[PDB]
């Protein structure tokens, strides 16, 4: 995640193993139950896309759901690209590039790039955009997996 250091700057720090394991354990115990979404939200505080793929990729089991989510993440990403067209002409030397759906999904962007966008002024909340897609896709799952 990207956290604020004592000095008063935003720097990246790694997520903790008993945080990781707590994510694992939630999924083990409460599967598709709604409490998973606030839980997720708390444990995703200050998290990167990269950390969010890590969390999704580290799941075991419920592979039908994991595939449905993936496909929702790509749909929501396809929709990001649709709604926000690429911008006019070449990229400025003085500036950094606008993200695509796949940069938001973490796929085409690097960590330093993910830190550029979030730490820069104005900052862009690529975590929160992926977060809604995850929560939206979580609703899809919850609604389906209701019996």
């Amino acid at each position: 995640p990207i956290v604020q250091n004592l000095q008063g700057q935003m720097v990246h720090q790694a997520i903790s193993p008993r945080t990781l394991n707590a994510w694992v354990k939630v999924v083990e115990e409460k599967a598709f139950s709604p409490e998973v979404i606030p839980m997720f939200s708390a444990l995703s505080e200050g998290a990167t896309p990269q950390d969010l793929n890590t969390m999704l990729n580290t799941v075991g089991g419920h592979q039908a759901a994991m595939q449905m989510l993936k496909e929702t993440i790509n749909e929501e990403a396809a929709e990001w690209d649709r709604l926000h067209p690429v911008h006019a002409g070449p990229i400025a030397p003085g500036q950094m590039r606008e993200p695509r759906g796949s940069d938001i999904a973490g796929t085409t962007s690097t960590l330093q790039e993910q830190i550029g966008w979030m730490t820069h002024n104005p900052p862009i909340p690529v975590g929160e955009i992926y977060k809604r897609w995850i929560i939206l896709g979580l609703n899809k799952i919850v609604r389906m997996y209701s019996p």
């Binding site: 592979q63 039908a64 595939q67 449905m68 389906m144």
Partner: protein, 74 residues
């Protein structure tokens, strides 16, 4: 176990089978296009006659929530 060896039981819910499929698909490392081909093809093909029948009625263009709700009583 190979991906071709993944098949749905005669009493096994589709759901439990689809989970097995994307777990084994999760251990395949092939190009995405090939894995798309595997998805639309092999899944239905090794599905049981009762659900197979059901899935044929959904037609093409179908998505996983609709397949998964379609074969629920089977």
């Amino acid at each position: 176990t190979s991906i071709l060896d993944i098949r749905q039981g005669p009493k096994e819910p589709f759901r439990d089978y689809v989970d097995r499929f994307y777990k084994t698909l999760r251990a395949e490392q092939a190009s995405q296009e090939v894995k798309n081909w595997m998805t639309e093809t092999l899944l239905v093909q090794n599905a049981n006659p009762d659900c197979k029948t059901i899935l044929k009625a959904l037609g093409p263009g179908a998505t996983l929530e609709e397949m998964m709700t379609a074969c629920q009583g089977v």
